[PDB]
Design a protein around this ligand. Structure first.
Ligand code: HEM
Length: 110
């Protein structure tokens, strides 16, 4: 099976390297990027991100609901366009299919 957990870990490394301020919105705010793997808040969040990817692929993802929840954190189209770029890099590093179409689905509700 595709190692989505690894892809997700690379995604967050890219995302927070390019936009460290995004990290302030999470429970692992202020935690050094190289140490996120040992952080409990991060582990939970990464697992949910992996779950969402598997749900998008599986056909059960609620993109409208995810979009609405991100709006509820003042995270919008600009952030998701940046995310799309970091996720594209992360997917290629692991021989994984691109997930741009899934981010587009979320963006369609933002
Ligand atoms: C590939 C793009 C993204 C995906 C697939 C994604 C996915 C998710 C999922 C599944 C959750 C959990 C939602 C729930 O529990 O119902 C979540 C929460 C969250 N996301 Fe994202 N997200 C993405 C991009 C971003 C970006 C760019 C930001 C910018 C800050 C962001 C900020 C947040 C925040 C603040 C939460 C809530 C964290 C908490 O509850 O402590 N997300 N995201």
């Amino acid at each position: 099976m595709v190692n989505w957990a690894a892809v997700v870990d690379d995604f967050y490394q890219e995302l927070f390297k390019a936009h460290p301020e995004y990290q302030n919105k999470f429970g692992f705010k202020g935690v050094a990027l190289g140490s996120l793997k040992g952080n409990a808040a991060y582990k939970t969040q990464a697992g949910k991100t992996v779950d969402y990817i598997n749900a998008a692929i599986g056909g059960s993802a609620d993109a409208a609901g995810l979009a609405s929840r991100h709006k509820g954190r003042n995270v919008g189209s600009a952030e998701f366009h940046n995310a799309k770029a970091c996720l594209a890099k992360a997917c290629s590093a692991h021989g994984a299919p691109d997930l741009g179409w899934a981010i587009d689905d979320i963006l369609s509700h933002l």
